[PDB]
Amino acid sequence: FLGMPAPLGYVPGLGRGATGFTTRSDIGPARDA
């Protein structure tokens, strides 16, 4: 919905079941354990 703020303590990467990808290792910051 447009014009509505995000809920507090919500990860937009989460809350959808989304999963990223890595086309290569040269792009993106180093993954931290």
Next chain:
Amino acid sequence: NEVTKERTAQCFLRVDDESMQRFHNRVRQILMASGSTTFTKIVNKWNT
């Protein structure tokens, strides 16, 4: 000559630069218009 029947002159032939440019343009438009086109169509156009 039609009278002496001798080799009075020598004729050197060459393909005109405009004709070469036209042929190159035809091949270029054959190739660039081949994103969605069968290989046989391209080969037939080139052969023609």
Next chain:
Amino acid sequence: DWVEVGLQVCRQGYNMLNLLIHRKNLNYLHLDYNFNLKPVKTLTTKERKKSRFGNAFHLCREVLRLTKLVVDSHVQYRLGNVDAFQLADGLQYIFAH
């Protein structure tokens, strides 16, 4: 001593390259101590696409390999396997080949 610093820099460069290799926790690209990178096994095609490094990384790896060769020639001379003439010839062959 210069040879000590060369060995230290070779080790540090190897450690930095190893840290860059294991960037996304992909631990199937083994980098040896002669700066030769090879897969540890028959990596999958998805992994092979996922384990692509740009030309800059491999340029850095090969330049560190060249410095490793130079410092290793110096170390070999210091040990006594090769004479000073042999060390100079080896360095010339490195810089020519």
Next chain:
Amino acid sequence: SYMLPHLHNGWQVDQAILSEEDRVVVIRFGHDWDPTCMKMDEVLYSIAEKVKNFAVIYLVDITEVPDFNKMYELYDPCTVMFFFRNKHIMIDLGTGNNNKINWAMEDKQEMVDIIETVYRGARKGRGLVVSPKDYSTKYRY
């Protein structure tokens, strides 16, 4: 660009992806001021109304919404993402990066074909769709 709707935070992007049950969501990740992003914006706006039936267009500024940059590799000047029923759809464009359209396409017909092929493939339950036109070569001659 400015004509298309804009999403300001990652939660709005999540809501936009979730709220579409029968249309493919096409999101342009980039900066409105980027010329390549400008080409994507103008093409999308040109075909924002033609494909309204089976698609929808949203614009997200990755500077104000960096929440996906790590996960979606949102570092190219302009990227295009396709989603269907909260599921990112891949396209075998032929460039080796099936996840997104990271380059600017001049022809709006090509983008309409891409959107339609994505809709057809994802409606059938598939997650990766083969692009109608190969893009491993720009065909410049």
Next chain:
Amino acid sequence: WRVWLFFMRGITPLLERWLGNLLARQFEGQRVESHFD
């Protein structure tokens, strides 16, 4: 030796900036006609 050193003095900035961007905490990363319109 000197030839390779003179290569190094010019190749250093590329690798330096590339590794500085790569090892940084946050990563960073046909337009003639469609520029003015």
Next chain:
Amino acid sequence: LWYEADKRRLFPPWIKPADTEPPPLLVYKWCQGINNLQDVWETSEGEC
């Protein structure tokens, strides 16, 4: 119109291309006519 123009010779022979010679034959005929002119390759008296 073309059938009439060939029935009655409206177009004199120099008008080209005719239905009798392909353009390469036209070039060959032009060369042969140039060569066959009476003493065309003469430069002793300064004719050009």
Next chain:
RNA sequence: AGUGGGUAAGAGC
């Protein structure tokens, strides 16, 4: 000389 442009998608265990 050279990297690529060579990721099938899916189901939960």
